[PDB]
Amino acid sequence: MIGLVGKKVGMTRIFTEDGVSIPVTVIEVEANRVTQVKDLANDGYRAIQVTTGAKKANRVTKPEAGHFAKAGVEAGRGLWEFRLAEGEEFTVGQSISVELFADVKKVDVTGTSKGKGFAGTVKRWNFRTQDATHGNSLSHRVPGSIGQNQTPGKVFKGKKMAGQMGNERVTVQSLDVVRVDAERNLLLVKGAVPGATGSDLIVKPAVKA
Amino acid sequence: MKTFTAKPETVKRDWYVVDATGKTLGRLATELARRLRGKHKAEYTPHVDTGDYIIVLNADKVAVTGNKRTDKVYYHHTGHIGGIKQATFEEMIARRPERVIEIAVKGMLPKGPLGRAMFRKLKVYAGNEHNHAAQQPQVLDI
Amino acid sequence: XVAAXXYXVXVXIXXX
Amino acid sequence: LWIARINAAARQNGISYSKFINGLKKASVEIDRKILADIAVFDKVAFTALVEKAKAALA
Amino acid sequence: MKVRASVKKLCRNCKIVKRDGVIRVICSAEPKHKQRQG
Amino acid sequence: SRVAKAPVVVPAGVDVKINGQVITIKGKNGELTRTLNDAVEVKHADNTLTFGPRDGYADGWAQAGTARALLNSMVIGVTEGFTKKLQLVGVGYRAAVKGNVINLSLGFSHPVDHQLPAGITAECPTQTEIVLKGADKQVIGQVAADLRAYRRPEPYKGKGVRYADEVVRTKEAKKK
RNA sequence: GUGAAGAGGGAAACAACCCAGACCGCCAGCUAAGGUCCCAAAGUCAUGGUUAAGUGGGAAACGAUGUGGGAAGGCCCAGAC
RNA sequence: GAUGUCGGCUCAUCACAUCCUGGGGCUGAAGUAGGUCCCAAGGGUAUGGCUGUUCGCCAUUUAAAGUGGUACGCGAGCUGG
RNA sequence: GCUGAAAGCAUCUAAGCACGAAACUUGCCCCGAGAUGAGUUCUCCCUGACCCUUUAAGGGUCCUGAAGGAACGUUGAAGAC
Ligand SMILES: [Mg+2]
Ligand SMILES: [Mg+2]
Ligand SMILES: [Mg+2]
Ligand SMILES: [Mg+2]
Ligand SMILES: [Mg+2]
Ligand SMILES: [Mg+2]
Ligand SMILES: [Mg+2]
Ligand SMILES: [Mg+2]
Ligand SMILES: [Mg+2]
Ligand SMILES: [Mg+2]
Ligand SMILES: [Mg+2]
Ligand SMILES: [Mg+2]
Ligand SMILES: [Mg+2]
Ligand SMILES: [Mg+2]
Ligand SMILES: [Mg+2]
Ligand SMILES: [Mg+2]
Ligand SMILES: [Mg+2]
Ligand SMILES: [Mg+2]
Ligand SMILES: [Mg+2]
Ligand SMILES: [Zn+2]
């Protein structure tokens, strides 16, 4: 099934009458407007392109403005595509609200993880540190050996090394839906989701089920 | 006088269409390689591409003898330490039929820049339809 | 081993 | 190079290089391969005549 | 199953059969007599 | 050889249509069809069918013997048919036929429901007996084997789904 | 005997193996070992056989109704197996 | 006219003659639990006491605490008993 | 295992048909058209004159400067640059 584009508002909790505190992530899901419908005949695959939010008119380029004008919708902050499931039909200009998740139970949330910059092997790959004392010379958090000897004579591809950590697309699966509030355009899911406050999120019905 | 040399700017190339239905893989490939290189022409020059354009149709119906449908294995390494991958002839035909013919012909063409240029003149199709009617290919029973 | 018995008590060449 | 060109031109006339050379020998034709390759490219009519002579000798 | 290099009939009910490219001994009377060359 | 040389007498009321290698036998019980090996030459003469080797094939006679045996069974199938009987033993082992699905209780924690093929029909005279009817000899044998597979006769007491004629060899429990 | 103190062709590559001993030049011809479907020069040559294992294209004692050929012999229309 | 040694630490990678988990045949296999052979390399596969030790013995775990190759892997990565 | 000859019987196999494992190909997650075989879809922008020579995917002059980009500035839960 199709999903919706939302925004990470932050985390809080929901106290139940039983006395259980549920950690929840608040996702603001405003109306998603269909901008284009892909069909097998013209594009070779079935999908819908949606936009959400608003954008300053002075920031919309003429190429982008023309695209929105054909659909007849106001400009949003971006464009996202969702693959259709054959039994699903949508029209250009249609608005989809958070009511889609009324009876979904479990969702998969995709977002961009927080960026950690250049990370070492201890942090990036959970490498063990060498001895802090007992003679160690300038080698407390260094990687150690990176290969064997002459037989290979090289380092193998995929060797875990220091480098950029974070700032990448991540999907968390099978998150329980706690509350769907159409009036407030809100979706509450149990647990933490990737990204910082204010980041764009992609919510879809759970695939594993 | 000096021996004649073909000029890459004045070479005349023709278009042909071949049907691969029920033809032995290897024996078909040798003929394709000959004509792609241009060994069938009196103007053959080893350093000039003097061959012809060949369209191969029905690549999925090519034949092999013996038990090679289930026993011929295609190997490739991805570059990562383990990375040794294998695929049988039947599996290749199911996933990407064109590859089978392309792989065979490539192994029979000269290696190097000129050989790669010769390979570009081969157009392999899994089905019975091609879109090169404008080039007016001539039927070649080979 | 090749180079044993000590060299520079460990630093090799020394002098410097 | 000359041999390869003669082979191609002969097969266009319906005979292999090996048989073509044998036929010329049996017909006492002493043209060498350098000249044969030149004729094969520049004078295709004359090359056809050579092939016919070779075929007649082999018969 | 007895996997051996030398497979042979062990009783009168033992039969030698070649399934695929493997010589096998199948016995109706005794299950202990079942053998495969390998 | 000997099997192939014997002709198959097609009885009255059975129509044999030979189209190339594809031969169809239609009778009162049903209609069966199959395509024969290229090395087999089948000729319909009078009320009999003659099977011979086709020139240019090494196996030849071997294939003809197979085709003859198969053809014979098809004729028998479309007239009288075939019957396979299975008996349940073990205390608590019961079977029931609901339409085309056979429900078996073989002492498992879950129910076993076996779906029957298109041409096979089953009946349970008692709770411990299953009789299969059909026109195809191969199919009826396959179904019987599938039912038997669920609980194969054990070697200590004989409990399980067994063929009616099958004799089950039993052994003693070690010693003392 | 060759290398050492010898080049050239073959053996994928490969002093010492096979063929063969480089005075210089030639866009001429014939051959040796080894080869002639394509990479890659020359037979998708001819006739008669064998193999189904990719054997060919690595390995023994031993095991086997694989299959081709040959000379015997018990046995068999008193109907054999 | 230099290829630095044993053990430890860090970091590994492959083979399968498989230690655990998966599939199966025979059993002198009632069940539970075993013996033995076949298939299978996806993942997984202890912490301490003593000794420089590898190893080994011992204590207590674990589904299991596999066997080998990699300059007896790894000092222009560490230590230096 | 089913049916089934060669080999009147047997026989899972030779023709034909069915089951069968964490291995294999998928299904799940991430990268990915420099995939030079450089793909597809949607939208936006530019609608002027003259000369010269070796006469052609030719050179030059004047007018024109679009869509968009970059630069600069205030910066970021983005970042060594
Ligand atoms: Mg120190
Ligand atoms: Mg120091
Ligand atoms: Mg320090
Ligand atoms: Mg080369
Ligand atoms: Mg000397
Ligand atoms: Mg040499
Ligand atoms: Mg050489
Ligand atoms: Mg001399
Ligand atoms: Mg000669
Ligand atoms: Mg050639
Ligand atoms: Mg021939
Ligand atoms: Mg020295
Ligand atoms: Mg030196
Ligand atoms: Mg093994
Ligand atoms: Mg897998
Ligand atoms: Mg070492
Ligand atoms: Mg070093
Ligand atoms: Mg010290
Ligand atoms: Mg010391
Ligand atoms: Zn026996």
Contact F152, F86 (CB under 8 A): no
Sign (positive or negative) of CA dihedral A169, A174, A180, A182: positive
Provide the residue ranges of all domains of chain F, joining segments of one domain with +: 1-80, 82-163
Contact A23, A190 (CB under 8 A): yes
CA distances from D46 to D38, E13, E30 (A): 11, 82, 85
- Report the distance separating Cα C5 and Cα F166, nearest Å: 85
CA distances from B119 to A89, B39, B48, B109, E3 (A): 45, 14, 14, 8, 51
Pairing label, strands A169-181, A47-51: unpaired
- Report the distance separating Cα D27 and Cα D41, nearest Å: 22
Residues of B in contact with D11 (CB under 8 A): 40
Give the DSSP H or E segment for F79. helix F61-79
Contact B44, D4 (CB under 8 A): yes
Phi-psi map region of B27: left, alpha, beta (phi>0 left; psi -120 to 50 alpha):
alpha
- Report the distance separating Cα F120 and Cα F135, nearest Å: 8
Which bases of strand I sit closer than 7 A to a protein CB?
Answer: 1-18, 24-25, 28-31, 37, 40-45, 67-69, 77-80
- Among chain B, residues having any CB pair with chain A shorter than 8 Å are 79-81
CB under 7 Å from strand H: A 127-128, 130-131, 134-139, 142-152, 156, 158-160; B 81-82; C 2-4, 7, 10; E 1-3, 31-32, 34, 38; F 155-156, 171, 173-175
Structural domain boundaries, residue A83:
1-209
3-state helix/strand/coil string of B38-67: CCCCCCCCCCCCCCCEEEEECHHHCECCCC
Across the interface, do B42 and D12 touch by the CB < 8 Å criterion? yes
**Which two three-digit tokens encode residue B101?**
């013919």
Q: Count structural domains, chain B.
A: 1
Considering only CA atoms, which of A185, A9, A177 is closest in space to residue A97? Answer: A185
How many Cβ atoms from other residues are within 10 Å of residue B58's Cβ?
Answer: 19
How many Cβ atoms from other residues are within 10 Å of residue A10's Cβ?
Answer: 12
- What is the CA angle D34-D39-D43, rounded to 5? 170
Q: Say what the resolution is, in angstroms.
A: 2.1
Nucleotide nearest to B82 (CA to C1'): H14
Long-range (24+ apart) CB contacts under 8 A made by A76-80 are A76/A33, A76/A51, A76/A52, A77/A51, A77/A52, A77/A53, A78/A5, A78/A51, A78/A52, A78/A53, A78/A200, A79/A35, A79/A49, A79/A50, A79/A51, A80/A5, A80/A49, A80/A50, A80/A51, A80/A202
CA distances from E6 to A73, E25, E31, E37, F44 (A): 82, 11, 18, 7, 49
Across the interface, do B42 and D40 touch by the CB < 8 Å criterion? yes
- What is the CA angle F127-F133-F138, rounded to 5? 120
Q: What is the CATH number of domain F1-80?
A: 3.90.930.12
- Report the distance separating Cα F102 and Cα F95, nearest Å: 7
- Report the distance separating Cα B60 and Cα B47, nearest Å: 33
Are F1-80 and F82-163 equal in CATH topology? yes
Which residues sit opposite B84 in a β-bridge?
A: B77
Which residues sit opposite A18 in a β-bridge?
A: none
Contact B60, B128 (CB under 8 A): no
CA at B73, C1' at I7: how many angstroms apart?
A: 37
Report the first-to-last Cα separation within chain D, whole angstroms. 29
Q: Count structural domains, chain A.
A: 1
**Which two three-digit tokens encode residue C1?**
């081993």
Q: What is the CATH number of domain F82-163?
A: 3.90.930.12
Long-range (24+ apart) CB contacts under 8 A made by D10-17 are D10/D51, D11/B40, D12/B40, D12/B42, D13/D47, D13/D48, D13/D51, D14/D51, D15/D51, D15/D54, D15/D55
| Cβ-based neighbours of A104, under 8 Å, separated by 6 or more | A177, A205, A206
- Report the distance separating Cα B62 and Cα B126, nearest Å: 10
CA at D33, C1' at G22: how many angstroms apart?
A: 26
Contact B25, B62 (CB under 8 A): yes
A191: burial class by Cβ within 10 Å (0-12, 13-18, 19+)? middle
Which bases of strand G sit closer than 7 A to a protein CB?
Answer: 27-30, 36-44, 52-54, 61-66
Contact A9, A197 (CB under 8 A): yes
Q: Where are the alpha helices (DSSP H) in chain B?
A: 25-37, 68-71, 89-95, 97-108, 113-119
| Cβ-based neighbours of F93, under 8 Å, separated by 6 or more | F104, F105, F106, F107, F128, F151, F159, F160, F161
